[PDB]
Design a protein that fits this description.
part of a larger assembly; 5 chains; C: mainly alpha; D: four-stranded parallel β-sheet; DNA-binding; Origin recognition complex subunit 4 (chain B); DNA-binding (chain D); acetylation (chain D)
Chain lengths: 157, 85, 122, 544, 325
DNA sequence: TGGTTTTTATATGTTTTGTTATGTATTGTTTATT
DNA sequence: AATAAACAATACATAACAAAACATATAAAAACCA
């Protein structure tokens, strides 16, 4: 229960420890220091905000593997639930839903989505647009099916 | 202090109807009679707000004050203790 | 027992809250962090959805059907405009108000299992 | 050019045909049910309007049509040697006692001359109608929307009609199309007139939703129109349970809308729609054969195939190694009738008349069928306890049904029919990156015009100052880009004199700020409180 | 209460505003704007197919949609449907809702003439509007199903269209199968306009279009304090030459001390001051060419007998160095 | 069609009523003494 | 329990104003006879 043991400072050496294990690049690793320095002034509880930001960028920088492997999405949160020694996975998801709207009015994430080209983009411009030709996920998609196919049929023969 | 039929809610309205058209009460802000024709015709087109609040909340005011009731109501009636406060 | 639907039922139960309540007190006592006899006060828009989002069982966000039942309730003459019945849509200065007595509110509170007599405190 | 002038006119498929044979055929079942209730409503008023011979015969007959939609039209009998006319009075035509009389006398009078083959428009015609038109009079009053009218006008109106009761050649009949709440109506009128009303009253109910006699009917006629050629998934039908429960007045027009739009979705994207008639087997292609593979019940049964048959040489051969046996593996399961349709029709007529139960919803009856909760469905009457074994059906996990189904697995008709309106607007203005992809290099380093203040518009107080908001707005704009932008164009001359001014940046901000907050008034986001002062405004739009 | 105010702003004249505004709205985000416009172009066959079902199509979204509707209605749809039924193409009747001068009588007088006058409908013309359209509806229930008209209603929450007797008029039009109703609104409280009665007649469907357009035409009727300090800025440019001087002597000692009441001057000494420079003969000759400053509301008087200018401290020195000098 | 009357939208004025801020007066709180 | 005195905390009377009810006016829409 380290996340609920609040009011402790994560120094410049401390925060880069928290992101080099989750494989963050240098672009965001300075930005986490940059926006903690933004939020070291107006904070309420330092443990909750520092973890809520690191999950959604790893949701957006690893989505070339996350959309291509669904199993690693539990892997990245549980390895922090062991690192932060949390209660369960109930409270950690309550953080990442919270601060996501709290960072939606800022600048850099609107860059970090369109800089990383990561998203998928043409789905959202067809989901929010209300397209009849949008993907209906009663199906498994052809790529993930082929990922399922080549894994199983080579396991078969 | 003693056999008197206390009435309901749904019936006092029928008694309350005659009391306002016996002019013992007035509506709070109701100019009664216009002087001439075209001032009355300007009041006919005007849709009103007091009807848009319901019957039991039209703020009725008083025509005959409480203290004058003691002088007319005889002491033989049982409510004579209620004329004075 | 009134015909209107469930989200419209909670739409009525939030509109009765600003009978004896004023904007000076409501935001303190309903924080996320008696005029039962008296004539009702005057609303504005979005103070409803201020109270409606609070007292509903994050579980709801789409407000298209919530906006549907407002002018449904306007045709029932249970909540009416202060001004004439014409321009009340586009947000100019338009004040709103209920026209239902306390008892029909009290039955419709228990008809959706919601408790109202707690929040009326002289 | 002309857009400131108002209303100027100007005078400038193998798949879809199989929809066309299905759509109208369904709609013949729709409107034929629509005229049934139309004949129902027209019947039950007509017999009840007549044959009511009261003894006092100095009272009008009144009819309260509770639950009615203020649009219920009425026809009348001919009933020769007497004219029978209809007058309608819309609350728009109810300004006073005076014009409620005067328009209504006008409306019957032209109706009187047209059947007859100068006068005054008041009750003078009513007594002389025997002499002015020969035969007698029986008028009827279609009060359309009765609860919007100031009732003291209506109460003073009916006393005026009370004076017409002494001529004996005229008969009066009143139709009160309320929306609801009969108890509200006896509160508003004068009690002396309710006792005038209470002579021969009839509280006929007219509701589109009355014990679901048509709601369960129209969904039933939907099922046979799509019988055996499709399915209806569980997440689809609960949407039809939840959302249709939010509209009390007219379910039946809404169930036509959301079902037919759902059918429009299937024909527009699904390639296997052509195969619902087995004559179209010649249209088979490898592209059709490729897209059949990603069906979830297809691949899951293959996972069921390997574990059941640990010899997989047969299962590998019937995979894409062959193609003739591969489609023959598909058309084995092609003609699946799925008797959940027929089992519904088996049990629907049963409890309708065997146990004779009417308070039931066939859609959740179909939904509880889809999970197996039919046993926990019939419990609410405890009348199928002698019949729960013969009306029993376990829903089988059918195969290949995911190609012939309807479901809101994509959230499409959730979005395009019931849109989260101020949610989707507010999501469009905070993010703006998932809507928009020389001068575009400025766009990669500067937000669009409407959205850039919106992040500070969230971060502002309840009532805000105009200028300090602009002062905060000038913070978000960096200086070097604008002078790079204002000096981008050498061709124009009139802009370039402004471009060389040393105060151009602070002038171009207030120009651009007064194009955005100018454009936040037609959206109603910000209201200008206390006009001709406009130093402070009010923000009503909150995130939720 | 030290508040920064819009009066204390560096203001911008008429030609300076509108030209640099025209520069942004045609060069700010041009490349991604047509990049959006090509993306949504593939939805155009989907709208054509649903519109055969008589569905009242409604477009919401941020930004102006006026350009998008006129491309979608005129060029794309209206000849496409005429070719698919088998000759002049389908008549388009737009309704400019941002134009406040739309009435219910005039547009419906166009409608019955746009629609077929097969009978003497002027006989039923006698408020007969709902009466005349009811006789139109039941006849149209038994006609062959084909669209003959598509109408467009821009800015349906507009200042005249949002009136309630006009709204119900459009409601009865939408139930007819022969006409397709493609409209757009812009308000955030637009679904307050309809109950389940009207939407039953409407059967609306919704689609998002957000191109973040500047609303050029829709900004014209709207006004703010850009559109008095600026009002009397032009009257002084055409007067007598003496009024410039007697306002110059007015503006000096009224700014010798915001421009409020307290900096003002008494009438007697100001008569003597404008007698000192051989300008004012007496009180009447002073006041008569001071009523001209009064008639165009260019100066105020409150009570010494204080006449004071109602413009700000910053404004009067702008009036000093530019127009008086 | 065409004039005439009636209603509505827009615009401003009048009187009552209810809210808030603030400087000054009142009232409570503590401690020593009778 | 009462008195006194210094000090702090709260209430009160009114000033300044806002806003809603109450009221009128006129050009434009809108019915409406004709």
């Amino acid at each position: 229960s380290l996340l609920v043991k609040k009011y402790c400072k994560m120094t410049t050496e401390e925060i880069i420890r928290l992101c080099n294990d989750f494989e963050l690049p240098r672009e965001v690793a300075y930005k986490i220091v940059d926006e903690y320095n933004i939020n070291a002034s107006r904070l309420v509880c330092p443990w909750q905000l520092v973890c809520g930001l690191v999950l959604n960028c790893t949701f957006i920088v690893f989505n070339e593997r996350r959309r291509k492997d669904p199993r690693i999405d539990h892997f990245i949160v549980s390895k922090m639930c062991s690192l932060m020694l949390t209660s369960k996975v109930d409270d950690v998801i309550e953080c990442v839903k919270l601060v996501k709207e709290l960072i939606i009015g800022e600048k850099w994430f609107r860059d970090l989505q369109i800089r990383y080209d990561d998203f998928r983009y043409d789905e959202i411009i067809f989901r929010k647009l209300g397209s009849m030709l949008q993907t209906t996920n009663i199906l498994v998609t052809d790529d993930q099916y082929n990922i399922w196919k080549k894994r199983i049929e080579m396991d078969l023969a | 202090r003693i056999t008197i039929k206390l009435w309901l809610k749904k019936d006092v309205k029928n008694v309350w109807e005659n009391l306002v058209q016996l002019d013992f009460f007035t509506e709070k802000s109701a100019v009664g009679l216009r002087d001439n024709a075209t001032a009355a015709f300007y009041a006919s087109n005007y849709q009103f707000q007091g009807t848009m609040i319901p019957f039991d909340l039209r703020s009725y005011q008083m025509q005959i004050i409480l203290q004058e009731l003691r002088r007319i109501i005889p002491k033989s009636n049982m409510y004579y203790s209620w004329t004075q406060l | 027992t009134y015909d209107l639907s469930i989200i419209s039922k909670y739409l009525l139960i939030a509109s009765y809250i600003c009978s004896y309540l004023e904007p000076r007190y409501d935001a303190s006592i309903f924080s996320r962090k008696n005029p039962r006899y008296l004539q009702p006060s005057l609303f504005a828009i979005e103070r409803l959805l201020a109270i409606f989002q609070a007292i509903f069982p994050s579980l709801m966000k789409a407000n298209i059907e919530v906006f549907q039942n407002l002018s449904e309730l306007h045709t029932l003459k249970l909540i009416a405009t202060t001004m004439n019945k014409n321009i009340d849509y586009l947000s100019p200065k338009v004040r709103w108000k209920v026209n239902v007595p306390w008892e029909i509110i009290k039955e419709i509170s228990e008809s959706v299992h919601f408790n109202i007599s707690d929040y009326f405190s002289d | 050019a002309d857009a400131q002038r108002s209303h100027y006119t100007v005078y400038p498929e193998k798949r879809w045909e199989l929809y066309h044979q299905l759509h109208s055929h369904f709609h013949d079942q729709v409107d034929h049910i629509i005229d049934n209730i139309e004949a129902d409503l027209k019947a039950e008023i007509s017999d009840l309007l007549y044959s009511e011979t009261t003894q006092k015969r100095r009272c009008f007959n009144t009819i309260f049509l509770l639950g009615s939609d203020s649009t219920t039209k009425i026809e009348l009998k001919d009933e020769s040697s007497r004219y029978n006319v209809l007058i309608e009075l819309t609350p728009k035509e109810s300004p006073n006692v005076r014009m409620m009389l005067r328009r209504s006398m006008y409306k019957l009078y032209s109706a009187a001359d047209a059947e007859e083959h100068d006068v005054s428009y008041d009750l003078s015609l009513v007594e002389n109608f025997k002499r002015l038109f020969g035969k007698d009079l029986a008028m009827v009053f279609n009060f359309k929307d009765v609860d919007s009218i100031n009732f003291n006008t209506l109460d003073n109106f009916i006393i005026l009609l009370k004076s017409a009761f002494k001529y004996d050649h005229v008969k009066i009949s009143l139709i009160f199309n309320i929306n609801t709440n009969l108890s509200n109506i006896e509160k508003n009128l004068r009690q002396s007139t309710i006792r005038l009303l209470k002579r021969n009253y009839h509280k006929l109910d007219v509701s589109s939703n009355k014990g679901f006699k048509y709601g369960n009917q129209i969904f039933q006629s939907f099922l046979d129109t799509v019988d055996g050629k499709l399915n209806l998934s569980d997440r689809f039908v609960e949407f039809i349970l939840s959302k249709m429960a939010n509209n009390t007045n007219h379910n039946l027009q809404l169930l036509t809308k959301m079902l037919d739009y759902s059918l429009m979705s299937y024909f527009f994207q699904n390639a296997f729609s052509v195969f619902i008639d087995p004559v179209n087997v010649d249209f088979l292609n490898d592209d059709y054969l490729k897209i059949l593979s990603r069906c979830p019940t297809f691949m899951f049964f293959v996972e069921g195939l390997i574990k059941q048959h640990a010899p997989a040489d047969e299962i590998l051969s019937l995979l894409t190694n062959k193609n003739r046996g591969l489609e023959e593996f598909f058309v084995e399961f092609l003609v699946r009738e799925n008797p959940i349709n027929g089992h519904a029709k088996f049990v629907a007529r049963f409890l309708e008349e065997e146990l004779n139960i009417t308070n039931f919803n066939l859609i959740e009856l179909y939904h509880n069928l889809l999970i197996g909760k039919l046993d926990s469905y019939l419990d609410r009457w405890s009348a199928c306890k002698e019949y729960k074994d013969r009306l029993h059906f376990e829903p089988i996990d059918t195969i290949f049904q995911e190609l012939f189904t309807l479901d809101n697995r994509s959230g499409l008709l959730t979005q395009s029919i019931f849109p989260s309106y101020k949610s989707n607007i507010e999501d469009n203005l905070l993010s703006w990156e998932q809507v928009l992809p020389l001068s575009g290099d400025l766009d990669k380093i500067m937000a669009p015009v409407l959205g850039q203040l919106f992040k500070l518009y969230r971060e502002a107080n309840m009532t805000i100052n105009i200028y300090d908001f602009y002062i905060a707005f000038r913070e978000t704009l960096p200086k070097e880009e604008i002078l790079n932008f204002i000096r981008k164009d050498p061709s124009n001359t009139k802009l370039l004199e402004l471009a060389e001014t040393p105060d151009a940046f602070d002038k171009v901000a207030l120009i651009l700020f007064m194009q955005a907050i100018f454009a936040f008034e037609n959206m109603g986001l910000i209201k200008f409180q206390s006009t001709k002062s406009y130093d402070l405004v009010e923000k009503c739009v909150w995130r939720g | 209460k030290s508040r920064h105010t819009m009066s204390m702003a560096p203001d911008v004249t008429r030609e300076e505003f509108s030209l640099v505004s025209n520069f942004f709205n045609e060069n700010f985000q041009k490349r991604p704007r047509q990049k959006l416009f090509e993306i949504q172009k593939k939805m155009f066959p989907q709208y054509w197919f649903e519109l055969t079902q008589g569905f009242s199509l409604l477009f919401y979204g941020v930004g102006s949609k006026r350009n998008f509707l006129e491309e979608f209605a005129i060029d794309y749809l209206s000849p496409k449907i005429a070719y698919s039924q088998l000759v002049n193409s389908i008549p388009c009747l737009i309704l400019n809702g941002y134009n406040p001068s739309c009435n219910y009588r005039d547009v419906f007088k166009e409608i019955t003439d746009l629609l077929v006058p097969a009978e003497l409908t002027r006989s039923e013309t006698k408020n007969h509007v709902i009466l005349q359209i009811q006789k139109m509806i039941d006849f149209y229930k038994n006609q062959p199903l084909d669209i003959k008209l598509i109408l467009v209603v821009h800015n349906l929450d507009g200042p005249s269209i949002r009136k309630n007797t006009f709204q119900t008029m459009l409601s009865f039009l939408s139930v007819i199968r022969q006409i397709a109703i493609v409209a757009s609104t812009d308000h955030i409280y637009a679904p307050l306009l309809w109950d389940n009665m009207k939407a039953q007649n409407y059967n609306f469907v919704f689609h998002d279009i957000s191109n973040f357009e500047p609303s050029t035409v829709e900004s014209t009727f709207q006004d703010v304090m850009k559109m008095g300090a600026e009002g009397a800025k032009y009257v002084l440019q055409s007067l007598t030459v003496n009024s410039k001087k007697m306002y110059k002597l007015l503006i000096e000692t009224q700014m010798q001390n915001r421009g409020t009441q307290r900096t003002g001057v008494e009438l007697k000494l100001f008569n003597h001051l404008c007698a000192a420079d051989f300008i004012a003969s007496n009180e009447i000759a002073l006041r008569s060419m001071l009523r001209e400053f009064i008639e165009h509301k260019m100066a105020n008087i409150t009570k010494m007998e204080i006449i004071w200018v109602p413009y700000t401290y910053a404004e009067l020195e702008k009036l000093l160095k530019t127009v008086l000098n």
